Amino acid sequence: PFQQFGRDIVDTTDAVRDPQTLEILDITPCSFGGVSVITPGTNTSNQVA
Amino acid sequence: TTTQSYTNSFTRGVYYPDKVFRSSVLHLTQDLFLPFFSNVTWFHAI
């Protein structure tokens, strides 16, 4: 009942309690990742993946 | 009146440092805690 925040091992906000409904919700990164463009030689073709 | 005997705290007086949830962790907190096995004053009520 006294807990409002929520963290984890590496001191990052993981879960949050709803201040309006007294319910719990956990937090996740949105879509973080990395874009890598796969392409053959530009002298051969221009299509990429 | 009352007495003034002394005792040992043992693993006592530890509170939650904040309102931050933490599950299955070993968080180290620097805060005003009661020292372990410290001297605690004893009083009486007559």
UniProtKB/Swiss-Prot annotation, chain B:
Glycans are attached at residue 39. It comes from the Viruses. Attaches the virion to the cell membrane by interacting with host receptor, initiating the infection. The major receptor is host ACE2. When S2/S2' has been cleaved, binding to the receptor triggers direct fusion at the cell membrane. When S2/S2' has not been cleaved, binding to the receptor results in internalization of the virus by endocytosis using host TFRC and GRM2 and leading to fusion of the virion membrane with the host endosomal membrane. Alternatively, may use NRP1/NRP2 and integrin as entry receptors. Binds to host ACE2. RBD also interacts with the N-linked glycan on 'Asn-90' of ACE2. Cleavage of S generates a polybasic C-terminal sequence on S1 that binds to host Neuropilin-1 (NRP1) and Neuropilin-2 (NRP2) receptors. Interacts with host integrin alpha-5/beta-1 (ITGA5:ITGB1) and with ACE2 in complex with integrin alpha-5/beta-1 (ITGA5:ITGB1). May interact via cytoplasmic c-terminus with M protein. May interact (via N-terminus) with host bilirubin and biliverdin, thereby preventing antibody binding to the SARS-CoV-2 spike NTD via an allosteric mechanism. This is Spike protein S1. It comes from Severe acute respiratory syndrome coronavirus 2. The gene is S. The chain holds residues 28 to 68 of 1273 of the full protein.
